[PDB]
């Protein structure tokens, strides 16, 4: 079988059925802070310095990390 399914390369494993040499021809099958709730820097006078500039906040639990992922 050619490993050309759209889900190939994901962490989730699906149990599907197939009768053809191409994996994408297979059935959908079945599978077998929170990133969306605006995770605070802590969940994942203050001063954030970057380059030659500094802003002043207050708490790290007041900084949202979009989708829980740092650049």
């Amino acid at each position: 079988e050619n490993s050309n399914s759209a889900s190939e390369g994901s962490t989730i494993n699906y149990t599907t059925i197939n009768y053809y040499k191409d994996a994408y021809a297979a059935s959908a099958g079945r599978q077998d802070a929170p990133p969306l709730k605006s995770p605070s820097a802590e969940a994942c006078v203050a001063q954030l310095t970057i380059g030659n500039s500094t802003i002043t906040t207050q708490e790290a639990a007041n900084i949202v990390i979009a989708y829980g992922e740092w650049p």
């Binding site: 001063q47 310095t49 970057i50 380059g51 030659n52 500039s53 500094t54």
Partner: protein, 41 residues
């Protein structure tokens, strides 16, 4: 404190502080009196 508000590099600073020791600041002769003994006046 530079390396607190800005991003800094490492500088191996060996600039001396000796010339500002009070001894060097003061041990230089200075005028403190002008005395005159004229013949006339």
């Amino acid at each position: 404190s530079d390396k607190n508000l800005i991003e800094t590099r490492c500088v191996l600073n060996h600039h001396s502080t000796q010339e500002t020791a009070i001894g060097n600041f003061f041990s230089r002769a200075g005028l403190v009196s002008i005395i005159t003994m004229p013949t006339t006046g």
